[PDB]
Ligand binder design. Structure first.
Ligand SMILES: [Zn+2]
Length: 421
């Protein structure tokens, strides 16, 4: 159980780029023993060891997606939810998970909120099952609401809120069943009421925070008396413990509070368009990257996202390393997976090896920059998750692309037919 990635053209560390924490390590080979990075730079092969020739290839740490809505992978077009079932939910998750894996992402976090009294299937179960079939680390962001006042009788089974205790109960169940607290867990669970300032009562967000903290879990939510951030603070919803998605429009005072509390953000540019950053980053608040639900982001893969992130940061005249950090080690520390997100000895072996065999890369003075700046989608000759090869030249064990294609095309038709009713 040893492997040697040899002769890499470039190696980005996902580091903050300082002298203490370098963003690029000019070194050439990488040894992996088990699930850990054993060494970096000038290594001689070993007898019977596995060898992967990364000649002309660029190495990056696998991506860490900190926000998503996988069911939406079958709702790509526009904004249905009540029509999801066993088969379907499973398909949407597989699809989005697959396209995420071939974009070099090894750690996915889904803000799942399909839950309702009497649901015939276990969403959470399905999500962890699929993630693992692919060999990916999964982070469950158990979402939901206790209110809605769209009323009720004019709301079907699927869209009805869950009583506060039902929610809490479920999380304890999930916390005990799947959550591993190591900083390199392959499974995680977090307290994530959809839009905390709406999905739940403010008295409920306090108690809801207490349970999460009591179970040693992190908190996450969509952040749409006084200021929103200031309100969250007053209801036990800030701290390096918590991180928010979709937080566009933020006061200077609000940024400071995020900076002092250590509350992170899940930056989603492509999605946020259908609706800042380097101020929060400068303020010191942790920044991570996510792509949420194909319903708001048709290009739900970490490469398209990272590309948009970089371009938008160039708009305000923001390096590639800067962004690679956000998409890797930055997201890891936001979700508490501290031994993940860095191509450094001692860390978990989650590595992406890209082959720039596409003409868009032909002519790059710094070929290392390609995966983020060239657009398109580099060829994953190799993806490693916990030291295991999940991808071999864009191929994943268990996936038949044409097959998966036909399935989705069929379900979408069914879906489209059914909404008419
Ligand atoms: Zn979202």
């Amino acid at each position: 159980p040893s492997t040697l990635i040899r002769n890499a053209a470039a190696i980005m560390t996902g580091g903050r780029g300082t002298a203490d924490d370098p963003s690029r390590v000019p070194g050439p080979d990488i040894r992996i023993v088990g699930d850990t990075i054993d060494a970096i730079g000038a290594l001689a092969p070993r007898p019977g060891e596995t060898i992967v020739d990364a000649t002309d290839c660029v190495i990056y740490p696998a991506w860490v997606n900190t926000h998503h809505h996988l069911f939406q992978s079958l709702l790509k077009g526009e904004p249905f939810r009540a029509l999801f079932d066993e088969r379907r939910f499973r398909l949407a998750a597989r699809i989005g998970l697959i396209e995420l894996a071939r974009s070099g992402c090894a750690t996915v976090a889904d803000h799942n909120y399909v839950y309702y009294p009497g649901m015939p299937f276990d969403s959470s179960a399905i999500l962890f099952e699929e993630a693992e079939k692919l060999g990916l680390r999964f982070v469950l962001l158990r979402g939901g609401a206790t209110q809605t006042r769209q009323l009720e009788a004019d709301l079907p089974t699927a869209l009805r809120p869950e009583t506060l205790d039902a929610y809490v109960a479920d999380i304890e169940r999930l916390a005990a069943r799947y959550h591993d607290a190591s900083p390199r867990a392959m499974r995680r669970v977090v307290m994530a009421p959809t839009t905390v300032l709406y999905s739940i009562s403010p008295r409920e967000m306090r108690e809801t925070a207490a349970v999460a903290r009591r179970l040693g879990l992190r908190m996450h939510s969509h952040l749409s008396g006084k200021s929103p951030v200031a309100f969250c603070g007053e209801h036990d919803w800030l701290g390096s413990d918590v991180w928010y998605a979709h937080l566009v429009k933020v006061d200077a005072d609000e940024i400071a509070l995020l900076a002092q509390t250590g509350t992170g953000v899940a930056h989603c540019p492509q999605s946020n368009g259908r609706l800042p950053v380097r101020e929060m980053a400068d303020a010191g608040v942790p920044v991570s990257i996510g792509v949420d639900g194909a319903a708001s982001n048709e290009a739900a893969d970490m490469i398209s996202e990272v590309h948009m992130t970089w371009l938008a940061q160039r708009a305000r005249l923001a390096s590639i390393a800067e962004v690679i950090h956000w998409g890797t080690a930055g997201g890891a520390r936001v979700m508490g997976l501290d031994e993940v997100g860095k191509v450094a000895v001692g860390y978990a072996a989650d590595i992406a090896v890209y082959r720039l065999d596409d003409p868009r890369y032909f002519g790059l003075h710094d070929p290392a920059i390609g995966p983020v700046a060239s657009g398109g989608r580099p060829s994953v000759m190799a993806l490693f998750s916990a030291g295991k090869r999940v991808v071999v030249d864009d191929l994943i064990e268990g996936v038949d692309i044409k097959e998966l294609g036909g399935e989705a095309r069929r379900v979408v038709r069914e879906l489209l037919r059914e909404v008419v009713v």
